Design a protein around this ligand. Structure first.
Ligand code: A1AB9
Ligand code: A1AB9
Ligand code: CL
Ligand code: CL
Ligand code: CL
Ligand code: CL
Lengths: 4, 124, 124, 4
Protein backbone atom coordinates (compact mmCIF):
# COMPACT_ATOMS: atom_id res chain seq x y z
CA UNK A 1 0.00 0.00 0.00
CA UNK A 2 1.22 3.52 -0.90
CA UNK A 3 0.14 7.18 -0.84
CA UNK A 4 -0.78 7.65 -4.56
CA UNK B 1 -9.00 12.59 -1.80
CA UNK B 2 -7.05 10.97 1.12
CA UNK B 3 -7.08 7.39 -0.40
CA UNK B 4 -4.30 4.75 -0.04
CA UNK B 5 -3.53 2.63 -3.12
CA UNK B 6 -2.64 -1.07 -3.50
CA UNK B 7 0.16 -1.07 -6.12
CA UNK B 8 -0.45 -4.65 -7.42
CA UNK B 9 -4.29 -4.44 -7.52
CA UNK B 10 -4.70 -3.74 -11.28
CA UNK B 11 -2.19 -6.51 -12.21
CA UNK B 12 -3.94 -9.01 -9.83
CA UNK B 13 -7.35 -8.14 -11.37
CA UNK B 14 -6.02 -8.73 -14.88
CA UNK B 15 -4.33 -12.03 -13.82
CA UNK B 16 -7.73 -13.22 -12.48
CA UNK B 17 -9.56 -12.07 -15.66
CA UNK B 18 -7.06 -14.15 -17.65
CA UNK B 19 -7.64 -17.19 -15.33
CA UNK B 20 -11.41 -16.82 -15.92
CA UNK B 21 -10.80 -16.67 -19.71
CA UNK B 22 -8.60 -19.83 -19.60
CA UNK B 23 -11.39 -21.73 -17.75
CA UNK B 24 -14.08 -20.23 -20.03
CA UNK B 25 -15.84 -18.65 -17.01
CA UNK B 26 -18.47 -15.96 -17.79
CA UNK B 27 -17.05 -15.43 -21.29
CA UNK B 28 -19.88 -13.79 -23.28
CA UNK B 29 -18.62 -13.55 -26.87
CA UNK B 30 -16.79 -15.60 -29.47
CA UNK B 31 -14.54 -13.66 -31.92
CA UNK B 32 -14.38 -15.49 -35.26
CA UNK B 33 -11.19 -14.94 -37.29
CA UNK B 34 -11.58 -16.98 -40.49
CA UNK B 35 -11.38 -20.66 -39.39
CA UNK B 36 -10.54 -19.80 -35.78
CA UNK B 37 -12.70 -18.96 -32.75
CA UNK B 38 -11.65 -17.10 -29.60
CA UNK B 39 -13.84 -16.87 -26.47
CA UNK B 40 -13.51 -13.68 -24.42
CA UNK B 41 -15.19 -11.18 -22.07
CA UNK B 42 -16.77 -8.19 -23.92
CA UNK B 43 -15.71 -5.80 -21.14
CA UNK B 44 -12.01 -6.72 -21.44
CA UNK B 45 -12.11 -6.41 -25.25
CA UNK B 46 -13.76 -2.94 -24.98
CA UNK B 47 -11.22 -1.88 -22.31
CA UNK B 48 -8.27 -2.74 -24.68
CA UNK B 49 -9.53 -1.97 -28.19
CA UNK B 50 -11.11 1.05 -29.88
CA UNK B 51 -12.82 -1.28 -32.37
CA UNK B 52 -14.43 -3.48 -29.65
CA UNK B 53 -15.32 -0.37 -27.60
CA UNK B 54 -17.26 0.90 -30.67
CA UNK B 55 -18.86 -2.54 -31.41
CA UNK B 56 -20.10 -3.32 -27.91
CA UNK B 57 -21.43 0.23 -27.18
CA UNK B 58 -23.61 -0.16 -30.33
CA UNK B 59 -27.29 -0.69 -29.28
CA UNK B 60 -27.65 -3.77 -31.63
CA UNK B 61 -24.13 -5.27 -31.61
CA UNK B 62 -23.85 -5.14 -27.77
CA UNK B 63 -26.26 -8.15 -27.71
CA UNK B 64 -24.43 -10.36 -30.21
CA UNK B 65 -22.68 -13.51 -28.91
CA UNK B 66 -20.60 -13.93 -32.14
CA UNK B 67 -18.46 -11.22 -33.89
CA UNK B 68 -16.86 -11.99 -37.24
CA UNK B 69 -13.66 -10.10 -38.01
CA UNK B 70 -12.56 -8.93 -41.49
CA UNK B 71 -11.23 -11.94 -43.53
CA UNK B 72 -7.85 -10.18 -43.99
CA UNK B 73 -7.21 -10.51 -40.20
CA UNK B 74 -4.62 -13.14 -39.35
CA UNK B 75 -5.75 -15.54 -36.51
CA UNK B 76 -2.23 -15.79 -35.00
CA UNK B 77 -1.97 -11.97 -34.96
CA UNK B 78 -5.38 -11.83 -33.24
CA UNK B 79 -4.35 -14.56 -30.72
CA UNK B 80 -1.13 -12.61 -29.81
CA UNK B 81 -3.18 -9.43 -29.29
CA UNK B 82 -5.93 -11.20 -27.28
CA UNK B 83 -3.14 -12.61 -25.00
CA UNK B 84 -1.70 -9.08 -24.68
CA UNK B 85 -5.14 -7.72 -23.67
CA UNK B 86 -5.38 -10.23 -20.80
CA UNK B 87 -1.71 -10.16 -19.68
CA UNK B 88 0.08 -6.85 -20.75
CA UNK B 89 2.63 -9.19 -22.49
CA UNK B 90 3.13 -8.95 -26.29
CA UNK B 91 4.82 -11.86 -28.07
CA UNK B 92 6.39 -9.70 -30.79
CA UNK B 93 8.71 -11.59 -33.20
CA UNK B 94 10.29 -10.97 -36.63
CA UNK B 95 7.96 -13.67 -38.05
CA UNK B 96 4.75 -12.13 -36.72
CA UNK B 97 5.39 -8.34 -36.45
CA UNK B 98 3.66 -7.40 -39.76
CA UNK B 99 0.52 -9.44 -38.83
CA UNK B 100 0.52 -8.08 -35.25
CA UNK B 101 0.80 -4.45 -36.45
CA UNK B 102 -1.95 -4.87 -39.08
CA UNK B 103 -4.24 -6.52 -36.49
CA UNK B 104 -3.46 -3.81 -33.85
CA UNK B 105 -4.29 -1.09 -36.45
CA UNK B 106 -7.66 -2.77 -37.22
CA UNK B 107 -8.41 -3.33 -33.50
CA UNK B 108 -7.37 0.29 -32.75
CA UNK B 109 -4.71 -0.58 -30.12
CA UNK B 110 -2.45 2.52 -30.47
CA UNK B 111 0.31 1.50 -28.00
CA UNK B 112 0.84 -1.84 -29.83
CA UNK B 113 0.89 -0.07 -33.25
CA UNK B 114 3.51 2.33 -31.76
CA UNK B 115 5.94 -0.41 -30.55
CA UNK B 116 5.52 -2.32 -33.89
CA UNK B 117 6.38 0.83 -35.88
CA UNK B 118 9.48 1.40 -33.67
CA UNK B 119 10.68 -2.25 -33.95
CA UNK B 120 10.19 -2.12 -37.77
CA UNK B 121 12.07 1.22 -38.12
CA UNK B 122 15.04 -0.24 -36.12
CA UNK B 123 15.35 -3.21 -38.59
CA UNK B 124 15.49 -1.01 -41.76
CA UNK C 1 9.05 -16.42 -23.42
CA UNK C 2 10.60 -13.40 -25.28
CA UNK C 3 7.57 -11.04 -24.69
CA UNK C 4 7.74 -7.24 -24.16
CA UNK C 5 5.36 -5.76 -21.55
CA UNK C 6 3.36 -2.49 -21.51
CA UNK C 7 3.78 -1.22 -17.92
CA UNK C 8 0.51 0.83 -17.79
CA UNK C 9 -1.72 -1.79 -19.52
CA UNK C 10 -3.34 -3.30 -16.37
CA UNK C 11 -4.03 0.19 -14.90
CA UNK C 12 -5.53 1.40 -18.26
CA UNK C 13 -7.77 -1.71 -18.43
CA UNK C 14 -9.04 -1.10 -14.89
CA UNK C 15 -9.62 2.65 -15.62
CA UNK C 16 -11.77 1.64 -18.63
CA UNK C 17 -13.67 -1.00 -16.59
CA UNK C 18 -14.46 1.76 -14.07
CA UNK C 19 -15.62 4.11 -16.92
CA UNK C 20 -17.94 1.32 -18.17
CA UNK C 21 -19.30 0.87 -14.61
CA UNK C 22 -19.94 4.66 -14.25
CA UNK C 23 -21.93 4.65 -17.54
CA UNK C 24 -23.70 1.39 -16.61
CA UNK C 25 -22.29 -0.34 -19.73
CA UNK C 26 -22.54 -4.17 -19.82
CA UNK C 27 -23.04 -4.33 -16.04
CA UNK C 28 -24.66 -7.74 -15.40
CA UNK C 29 -25.48 -7.81 -11.68
CA UNK C 30 -26.94 -5.61 -8.96
CA UNK C 31 -25.55 -6.10 -5.41
CA UNK C 32 -28.22 -5.27 -2.83
CA UNK C 33 -26.94 -4.04 0.55
CA UNK C 34 -30.01 -3.38 2.70
CA UNK C 35 -31.71 -0.30 1.16
CA UNK C 36 -28.91 0.29 -1.36
CA UNK C 37 -28.21 -1.13 -4.83
CA UNK C 38 -24.87 -1.24 -6.65
CA UNK C 39 -24.53 -2.21 -10.34
CA UNK C 40 -21.31 -3.99 -11.32
CA UNK C 41 -19.60 -6.48 -13.66
CA UNK C 42 -19.54 -10.08 -12.27
CA UNK C 43 -16.03 -10.65 -13.67
CA UNK C 44 -14.54 -7.67 -11.81
CA UNK C 45 -16.25 -8.69 -8.54
CA UNK C 46 -14.91 -12.29 -8.90
CA UNK C 47 -11.41 -10.95 -9.76
CA UNK C 48 -11.33 -8.89 -6.46
CA UNK C 49 -13.29 -10.94 -3.93
CA UNK C 50 -13.14 -14.53 -2.67
CA UNK C 51 -16.86 -14.35 -1.82
CA UNK C 52 -17.91 -13.20 -5.34
CA UNK C 53 -15.47 -15.70 -6.93
CA UNK C 54 -17.32 -18.47 -5.00
CA UNK C 55 -20.83 -17.07 -5.80
CA UNK C 56 -20.37 -16.60 -9.54
CA UNK C 57 -18.56 -19.96 -10.12
CA UNK C 58 -21.65 -21.65 -8.57
CA UNK C 59 -23.69 -23.40 -11.34
CA UNK C 60 -27.01 -21.78 -10.10
CA UNK C 61 -25.83 -18.41 -8.70
CA UNK C 62 -23.72 -17.60 -11.83
CA UNK C 63 -27.06 -16.86 -13.62
CA UNK C 64 -28.57 -14.53 -11.02
CA UNK C 65 -28.89 -10.81 -11.89
CA UNK C 66 -29.46 -9.80 -8.21
CA UNK C 67 -27.31 -10.80 -5.16
CA UNK C 68 -28.45 -9.84 -1.67
CA UNK C 69 -25.70 -9.37 0.90
CA UNK C 70 -25.97 -10.21 4.62
CA UNK C 71 -28.07 -7.51 6.43
CA UNK C 72 -25.14 -6.77 8.80
CA UNK C 73 -23.14 -5.39 5.81
CA UNK C 74 -22.84 -1.61 5.83
CA UNK C 75 -23.67 0.01 2.40
CA UNK C 76 -20.97 2.73 2.76
CA UNK C 77 -18.38 0.04 3.59
CA UNK C 78 -19.51 -1.89 0.50
CA UNK C 79 -19.40 1.28 -1.68
CA UNK C 80 -15.79 2.05 -0.53
CA UNK C 81 -14.75 -1.54 -1.35
CA UNK C 82 -16.55 -1.58 -4.73
CA UNK C 83 -14.68 1.69 -5.60
CA UNK C 84 -11.41 0.03 -4.51
CA UNK C 85 -12.12 -2.98 -6.77
CA UNK C 86 -12.47 -0.70 -9.82
CA UNK C 87 -9.69 1.79 -8.99
CA UNK C 88 -7.01 0.25 -6.58
CA UNK C 89 -7.81 3.28 -4.30
CA UNK C 90 -9.20 2.69 -0.77
CA UNK C 91 -10.89 5.60 1.01
CA UNK C 92 -9.89 4.47 4.51
CA UNK C 93 -10.86 6.89 7.32
CA UNK C 94 -11.17 6.77 11.13
CA UNK C 95 -14.98 7.03 10.70
CA UNK C 96 -15.29 4.09 8.31
CA UNK C 97 -12.36 1.72 9.12
CA UNK C 98 -14.40 -0.71 11.29
CA UNK C 99 -17.14 -1.01 8.59
CA UNK C 100 -14.54 -1.33 5.79
CA UNK C 101 -12.65 -4.10 7.65
CA UNK C 102 -15.84 -6.05 8.48
CA UNK C 103 -17.02 -5.76 4.84
CA UNK C 104 -13.54 -6.79 3.48
CA UNK C 105 -13.58 -9.85 5.83
CA UNK C 106 -17.05 -10.89 4.53
CA UNK C 107 -16.05 -10.23 0.89
CA UNK C 108 -12.76 -12.13 1.44
CA UNK C 109 -10.45 -9.28 0.31
CA UNK C 110 -7.28 -10.23 2.30
CA UNK C 111 -5.08 -7.24 1.33
CA UNK C 112 -7.76 -4.76 2.51
CA UNK C 113 -8.26 -6.70 5.79
CA UNK C 114 -4.44 -6.55 6.25
CA UNK C 115 -4.14 -2.73 5.87
CA UNK C 116 -7.22 -2.20 8.15
CA UNK C 117 -5.66 -4.39 10.87
CA UNK C 118 -2.36 -2.42 10.58
CA UNK C 119 -4.10 1.01 10.71
CA UNK C 120 -6.15 -0.13 13.76
CA UNK C 121 -3.07 -1.50 15.61
CA UNK C 122 -1.24 1.87 15.05
CA UNK C 123 -4.14 3.81 16.74
CA UNK C 124 -4.20 1.65 19.94
CA UNK D 1 7.32 -0.94 -23.02
CA UNK D 2 9.86 -2.97 -20.98
CA UNK D 3 11.57 -6.38 -20.85
CA UNK D 4 9.51 -8.03 -18.03
N1 A1AB9 E 1 -14.11 0.11 -22.45
C1 A1AB9 E 1 -13.75 1.16 -22.73
C2 A1AB9 E 1 -13.35 2.50 -23.05
C3 A1AB9 E 1 -13.90 3.61 -22.42
CL1 A1AB9 E 1 -15.18 3.39 -21.33
N2 A1AB9 E 1 -13.49 4.86 -22.60
C4 A1AB9 E 1 -12.47 4.99 -23.44
N3 A1AB9 E 1 -11.84 4.04 -24.12
C5 A1AB9 E 1 -12.29 2.77 -23.94
N4 A1AB9 E 1 -11.62 1.78 -24.56
C6 A1AB9 E 1 -10.80 1.93 -25.67
C7 A1AB9 E 1 -11.08 2.92 -26.62
C8 A1AB9 E 1 -10.13 3.30 -27.55
C9 A1AB9 E 1 -8.89 2.69 -27.51
C10 A1AB9 E 1 -8.58 1.74 -26.54
C11 A1AB9 E 1 -9.53 1.37 -25.60
C12 A1AB9 E 1 -7.13 1.39 -26.68
C13 A1AB9 E 1 -6.70 2.21 -27.88
O1 A1AB9 E 1 -5.59 2.23 -28.39
N5 A1AB9 E 1 -7.77 2.92 -28.30
N1 A1AB9 F 1 -11.95 -14.31 -10.65
C1 A1AB9 F 1 -11.20 -14.91 -10.03
C2 A1AB9 F 1 -10.26 -15.72 -9.31
C3 A1AB9 F 1 -9.58 -16.78 -9.89
CL1 A1AB9 F 1 -9.97 -17.22 -11.49
N2 A1AB9 F 1 -8.63 -17.49 -9.31
C4 A1AB9 F 1 -8.34 -17.10 -8.07
N3 A1AB9 F 1 -8.90 -16.12 -7.37
C5 A1AB9 F 1 -9.88 -15.42 -7.98
N4 A1AB9 F 1 -10.42 -14.38 -7.32
C6 A1AB9 F 1 -10.36 -14.18 -5.95
C7 A1AB9 F 1 -10.36 -15.28 -5.09
C8 A1AB9 F 1 -9.99 -15.14 -3.76
C9 A1AB9 F 1 -9.62 -13.88 -3.31
C10 A1AB9 F 1 -9.56 -12.79 -4.17
C11 A1AB9 F 1 -9.92 -12.94 -5.50
C12 A1AB9 F 1 -8.98 -11.64 -3.41
C13 A1AB9 F 1 -8.79 -12.20 -2.02
O1 A1AB9 F 1 -8.35 -11.61 -1.05
N5 A1AB9 F 1 -9.18 -13.50 -2.05
CL1 CL G 1 -25.14 -13.70 -32.23
CL1 CL H 1 -2.60 -0.99 -26.79
CL1 CL I 1 -32.10 -12.87 -10.28
CL1 CL J 1 -7.82 -7.00 -1.59
Amino acid sequence: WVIP
Amino acid sequence: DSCIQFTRHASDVLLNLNRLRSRDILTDVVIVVSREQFRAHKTVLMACSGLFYSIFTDQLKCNLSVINLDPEINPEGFCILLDFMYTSRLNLREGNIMAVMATAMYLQMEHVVDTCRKFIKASE
